[PDB]
Amino acid sequence: ITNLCPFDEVFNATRFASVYAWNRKRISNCVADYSVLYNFAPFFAFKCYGVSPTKLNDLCFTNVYADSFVIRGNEVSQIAPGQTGNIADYNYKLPDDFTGCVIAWNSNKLDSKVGGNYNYLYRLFRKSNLKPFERDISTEIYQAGNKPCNGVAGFNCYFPLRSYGFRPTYGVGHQPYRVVVLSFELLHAPATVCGPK
Amino acid sequence: SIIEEQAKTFLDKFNQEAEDLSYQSALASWNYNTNITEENAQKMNEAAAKWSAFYEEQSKLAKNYSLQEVQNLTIKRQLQALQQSGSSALSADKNKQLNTILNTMSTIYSTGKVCNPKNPQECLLLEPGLDDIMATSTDYNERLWAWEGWRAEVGKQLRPLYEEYVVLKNEMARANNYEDYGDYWRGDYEAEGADGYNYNGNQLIEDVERTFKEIKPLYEQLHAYVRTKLMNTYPSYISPTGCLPAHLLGDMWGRFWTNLYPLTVPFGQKPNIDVTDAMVNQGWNAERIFKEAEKFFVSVGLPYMTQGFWENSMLTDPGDDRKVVCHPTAWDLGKGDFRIKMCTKVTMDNFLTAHHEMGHIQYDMAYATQPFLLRNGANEGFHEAVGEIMSLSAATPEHLKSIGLLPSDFQEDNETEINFLLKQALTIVGTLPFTYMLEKWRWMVFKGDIPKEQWMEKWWEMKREIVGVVEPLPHDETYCDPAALFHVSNDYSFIRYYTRTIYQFQFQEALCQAAKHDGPLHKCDISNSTEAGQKLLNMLRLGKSEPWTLALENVVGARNMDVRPLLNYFEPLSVWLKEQNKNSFVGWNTDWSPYA
Ligand SMILES: *[C@@H]1O[C@H](CO)[C@@H](O)[C@H](O)[C@H]1NC(C)=O
Ligand SMILES: *[C@@H]1O[C@H](CO)[C@@H](O)[C@H](O)[C@H]1NC(C)=O
Ligand SMILES: *[C@@H]1O[C@H](CO)[C@@H](O)[C@H](O)[C@H]1NC(C)=O
Ligand SMILES: *[C@@H]1O[C@H](CO)[C@@H](O)[C@H](O)[C@H]1NC(C)=O
Ligand SMILES: *[C@@H]1O[C@H](CO)[C@@H](O)[C@H](O)[C@H]1NC(C)=O
Ligand SMILES: *[C@@H]1O[C@H](CO)[C@@H](O)[C@H](O)[C@H]1NC(C)=O
Ligand SMILES: [Zn+2]
């Protein structure tokens, strides 16, 4: 037991990323201690699929991907395989055959200020949906009519990205939430991520 | 279609952008109201200003999507509310003229003084100057001069302003494809949907008349009782077979007859039920009062109160170097923020007002998931009808006996019930013909059936027939009696007070049959009943997404308004009044006048 994985700089980070620019970290060649993970907040959401929630520290995988972002309260249900909405259609998509865990908790005391936090953005308009595990960071103007937009905002020409504006006196369903998605893959290669002996 | 998708995208952007501005305006208003200071006002105004501007742009930019090309009803309902423009349909000069007329009328009403004869050195104002005289005094001439001065000093200055007010508002109404301003007000009841769920503004007149023709006999009986009781205090000024003088109805305009209870009490040796002494003895505060209402609401199967409700609400007078507006109100600031402002004292009236306001809060929480522009009550009468039934249910001498404010061996006599019903009648039944007559007169004046040269004649010819009130002194065409009322001179609708009274009782009946209640209707408690709460929440969660006919059907079982529950509520009192009026005349004539 000498190569503990760096899960502490994925849950204790000082600044998370927006939904449309979600952050991906690849974890390989370490021993994974899936028990410090329980030491954090009451974990409003600790739901996961294809894997026993109590016997993770018994099986070996070739790679673990951690994706981090911040969403709203009444959108955590959209982080699940086979769902339709706004976050799950234009921002972040999960495959139907998903093997991994979804963790989500509350961050009102950290990501909410009097006056509004306008640093968190999400996409509102897109021409087509997203294939699973895909990113779009373009800022071209959405065209909704026959008239060509020609690089200027106006009638039937919308800027595709909008903000949240969190304030401390909001309700539970409009408060900030931090979400980490862990995806385990097992490919044809030597397995290099395993639990403690 | 193609226009429908563009409308959907436009509404998505509007909904995204409007929540923030509305929330900022609401928060500024709250901070001003709970903390009165000069610089807290300016910010408020600024916030409000921005909101207006935003709306004033979108209502134009939303007129470019033809409404007939949208087929799905929710999008059409959202877009129609946005497309409606009011005073913006006129030019700048006429809008400025209308605004300067309205401000002048409001200012004249607010600062008005009636100077007493007999050493006119101390003149009285309106609010704490004449309400006391007209609600407490028992002197004929003292009431007469106060009644006449308010019409001869404030009513005669509002005639020329009103005459051109009407002309401006009719043109503003015709600028929006209407016939008159009365149609503009009656169009709030428009409903569009499937077959049999439609409703225009012309059916409201017929429904109101149909309901009043049934309500009238009970009013006649109550009128006869009050007439035969007022002859012991004004012997020579009342005819046994005539109308009632206007300045002897316990109010400045006669809107409410509550202040006649000391003179018309059936049995004066039996006091009413008051639980203030028990509340003070046991030891109660505002928090206990507001928690005993949350228990009532969660008894029937409704959600608890939000945590932010207990932290962001002012339930007591601060009692420090901070000035607050002391008037109960329930605030829905948006984004899951619900608050209540109220100066709470340990009394029974505050105990009932808490239920009334938490009814509004629970109504707001039900449709918080609906989209913007569809996040209001079904019409302008549902919101108070929900609050009033809770107050009715939380005041019976069986709910108070459960919470421990009355002895466990308390038995109710039949003498107190008659007194309670008479007090309720004097404030419910006695205000319906007044509202009907006022709104009918205003509709006729707007539409043109009443020419300008015959305004007060129609007033004191309709009041002597519909209501039964006769003027003390002659009034020619120089006065404007209706303008001496707060709602008439401040651009406010008045029929919302007529429909609500009809609605509430219906609701109560539907919530007393589901609760398996056996007995008279005025002793119904819907606590510890889950099916009643579920049936009510079936209607609470819609909002404006569906026509109000479907919302009414979801809770009552009928698609329209009827008066049978109201008459069922007041049945023991009707029997008692009929028994008590054998040797008396039921009715009135329109030929007797105090001045002639
Ligand atoms: C984050 O840091 C805190 C205290 O330093 C503690 O909960 C733990 O070390 C970290 N939490 C996780 C989930 O790694
Ligand atoms: C009331 O407003 C003043 C600003 O005029 C502010 O300083 C004060 O803190 C406010 N009261 C409270 C309780 O915050
Ligand atoms: C949108 O409406 C304005 C009027 O406010 C009009 O001038 C403009 O041409 C319209 N745009 C269209 C029809 O594309
Ligand atoms: C109309 O629009 C609403 C959007 O709120 C949608 O749910 C519904 O399926 C659409 N069609 C009908 C027939 O209501
Ligand atoms: C309602 O149920 C509670 C719980 O048993 C009971 O104490 C109470 O007496 C019942 N009735 C009323 C009117 O609260
Ligand atoms: C009340 O009940 C008593 C008991 O019989 C009866 O004598 C009396 O007439 C009743 N009074 C009313 C007003 O019902
Ligand atoms: Zn109210």
Author numbering:
A (entry chain B): 332 to 528
B (entry chain A): 19 to 614
Recite the paper's sentences.
The trimeric spike (S) protein is the major glycoprotein on the SARS-CoV-2 envelope and is responsible for engaging the ACE2 receptor for viral entry, and thus, it is a prime target for vaccine design and therapeutic antibody development. Receptor-binding domain (RBD) in the S protein plays an essential role in ACE2 receptor recognition, and mutations in the RBD affecting receptor binding and viral infection have been reported. To unravel the underlying molecular mechanism of the S proteins of Omicron BA.2, BA.2.12.1, BA.2.75, and BA.4/5 bound to hACE2, we determined their atomic structures of the S (BA.2, BA.2.12.1 or BA.4/5) or RBD (BA.2.75) in complex with hACE2 by cryo-EM or X-ray crystallography. According to our previous reports, the binding interface between RBD and ACE2 could be divided into two patches (patch 1 and patch 2).
As for hamster, it is susceptible to SARS-CoV-2 infection. Compared with hACE2, H34 is replaced by Q34 in ghACE2, mACE2 and RatACE2. In patch 2, residues Y449, R498, T500, Y501, and G502 of BA. RBD form an extensive H-bond network with D38, Y41 and K353 of the ghACE2. Therefore, it seems that more polar interactions are occurring in ghACE2/BA. RBD interface, consistent with the SPR result that ghACE2 has a higher binding affinity for BA. Notably, hydrophobic contact between residue L79 of the ghCE2 and I79 of the RatACE2 may also stabilize the interface. Given that Q493 has a relatively shorter side chain than R493, R493Q substitution may weaken interactions between R493 of BA. RBD and Q34 (and K31) of ghACE2. Notably, BA.2-R493Q mutant has a significantly decreased binding affinity towards mACE2 or golden hamster, and slightly impairs the binding capacities of BA.2 to ratACE2.
